[PDB]
Each structure stands twice: as structure tokens, then as C-alpha cells.
Design a protein around this ligand. Structure first.
Ligand SMILES: CC(=O)N[C@@H]1[C@@H](O)[C@H](O)[C@@H](CO)O[C@@H]1O
Ligand SMILES: CC(=O)N[C@@H]1[C@@H](O)[C@H](O)[C@@H](CO)O[C@@H]1O
Ligand SMILES: CC(=O)N[C@@H]1[C@@H](O)[C@H](O)[C@@H](CO)O[C@H]1O
Length: 243
């Protein structure tokens, strides 16, 4: 599997501070859990040329690193060495509950960000739990409790199209071709579109944004380590958010 492209030592170099005693998630995010989880999504990091596979791994780790970052500008090893520091969304402003016939909010539960992709909203927890055969809609805390399930939610999100959004996977592997609406809106293949899929409503199409820049910094660092180009279209500053 992906262990051939990303070794334990490389993962540890990338996520240099995940086991820092200063990080709330210390000990939770393990290479073994990452590899185990990836087995359930066998085309992740095994699609296309070696160059593409490395870029996919860098893109996934880059985005998830931003979602979980403990970085600050003057941090040791730079802000892009502080991925995977957090497990739960810091200071959430709501329970992330939206109307959903299929995946209604479970009374008393909250769908704030958890795990590497900071999975949010009942309408993500619902179908993710269905795919993973666990009750994430009724027990969203599971994403912050079992390390393999945690990684699986992130990979699920990455691998799953949700129209009109393609999967992050299909974008980074070059399988996704933009529609006429996409090319008009400047949603072109690259890391920027991936940011848009993940959190574009809040981060994209509004000009320069430090969260978008942070996502790019991790991706650049990881592509450097893996020895691949990042490609272009890295930001979504001028991209209309997806529908
Ligand atoms: C641990 C934490 O609070 N992570 C959040 C994440 O939930 C949010 O989606 C992201 C947006 O850019 O930035 C934050 O760092
Ligand atoms: C954000 C980040 O770490 N960028 C680095 C850059 O500093 C370095 O010169 C290059 C080659 O090693 O790799 C990455 O682009
Ligand atoms: C990783 C994740 O859950 N991302 C969601 C995204 O699916 C949703 O479209 C958006 C709405 O603003 O909220 C983000 O938190």
C-alpha cells in the first residue's frame, strides 16, 4: 500500500510535533493508524504515476495538517511542522446541525470538527458513518476516540464526491475535469479547488486569507520532502465556492 511511498520516518519528519507534550492530541495520531485506515481506501495514494501518488499524499497530509495545526509563525521548525496537534475543533461556535431528512441531528449531539479533516456537520457524519459501518451520527465523539476510525473519516471525506463537488482524490489525481461553471468561476485543477471542497464557503473567493495560506504552506513543505512539484492553482482566493 501507501507505506511504499510514505515511510514511518517520513511521516514522523512531516508530523514532527504530533507527539510533543504541548499538543492536546499527543499519542493519538499514529503512522500505524494512518496505514491501517488507508487499507479501507485502497486507491488513495495508489492512483496514477509515482509523482501523482506522492502529490496526493502530500495534499492529504497538507490539508489535514492545517485542520489540526498547533502552528504559530515563530514556532520551532516553522508553522508547517505543527500539523496533527489537535483532535477537536477549538472553541466551536455552534453544534453544526443543519436540516437533513436522511441524516437528522441526534438530540444532544454536536458535529464540530473532529479528527484529521475536522469532519463537521450532521450531513457529513451521517453518510460517513454509513460508509464506515459505525454510528457517527448518533455518536460523533467516536471520531475523536478511536484512532483508526479518526483517520478513516478523513480518508472517507477525501475520497467521496458530493455533487457539485468532486472528490479531493479525483482532483489531485487528474481524473476530475472542470465544468463550464468551474472554469468560469476559476475552479481549476489544483490544491486551491481542494481547499474549496473542504471549507470553501468560509475560505474561498474572498481574496487573501491566512487559513488558505496555511494550507498551502503545509502542502509545499510536504511536496518538498516527497520531492515533487505542488502544481499551480494553489489558492482559492478568486474561486467562487462550490455549490
Ligand atoms: C483544531 C481546530 O480548531 N481546527 C480548526 C478547523 O476545525 C477549521 O476547520 C480550520 C479552518 O481553517 O481551522 C482551524 O484550525
Ligand atoms: C513551506 C515550505 O516548507 N517550503 C519549502 C521551501 O522552503 C524549500 O526551499 C523547498 C525546497 O526544499 O521546499 C518547500 O517548498
Ligand atoms: C471537512 C468538512 O466537514 N468540511 C465541511 C464541508 O463539507 C461543508 O461543505 C462546509 C460548509 O460550510 O463545512 C465544512 O466544515
Amino acid at each position: 500500500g501507501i507505506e511504499k511511498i510514505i515511510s514511518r520516518s517520513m511521516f514522523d519528519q512531516m508530523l514532527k510535533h504530533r507527539n510533543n507534550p504541548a499538543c492536546p492530541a499527543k499519542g493519538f495520531y499514529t503512522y500505524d493508524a494512518f496505514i491501517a485506515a488507508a487499507k479501507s481506501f485502497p486507491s488513495f495514494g495508489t492512483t496514477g504515476s509515482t509523482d501523482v501518488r506522492k502529490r496526493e499524499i502530500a495534499a492529504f497530509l497538507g490539508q489535514t495538517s492545517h485542520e489540526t495545526t498547533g502552528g504559530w509563525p515563530s514556532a520551532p521548525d516553522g508553522p508547517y511542522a505543527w500539523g496533527y496537534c489537535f483532535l477537536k475543533e477549538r472553541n466551536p461556535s455552534s453544534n453544526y446541525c443543519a436540516p437533513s431528512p436522511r441524516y437528522p441531528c441526534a438530540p444532544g449531539k454536536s458535529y464540530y470538527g473532529r479528527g484529521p479533516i475536522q469532519l463537521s456537520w450532521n450531513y457529513n457524519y451521517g453518510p460517513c458513518g454509513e460508509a464506515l459501518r459505525v454510528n457517527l451520527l448518533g455518536n460523533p465523539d467516536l471520531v475523536a476516540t478511536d484512532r483508526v476510525i479518526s483517520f478513516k473519516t478523513a480518508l472517507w471525506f477525501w475520497m467521496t464526491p458530493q455533487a457539485p463537488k468532486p472528490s479531493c482524490h479525483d482532483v489531485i489525481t487528474g481524473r476530475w475535469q472542470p465544468s463550464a461553471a468551474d472554469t468560469a468561476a476559476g475552479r481549476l485543477p489544483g490544491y486551491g479547488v481542494i481547499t474549496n471542497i473542504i471549507n470553501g464557503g468560509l475560505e474561498c473567493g474572498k481574496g487573501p486569507n491566512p487559513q488558505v495560506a496555511d494550507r498551502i504552506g503545509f502542502f509545499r513543505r510536504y511536496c518538498g520532502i516527497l520531492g515533487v512539484g505542488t502544481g499551480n492553482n494553489l489558492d482559492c482566493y478568486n474561486q467562487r465556492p462550490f455549490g
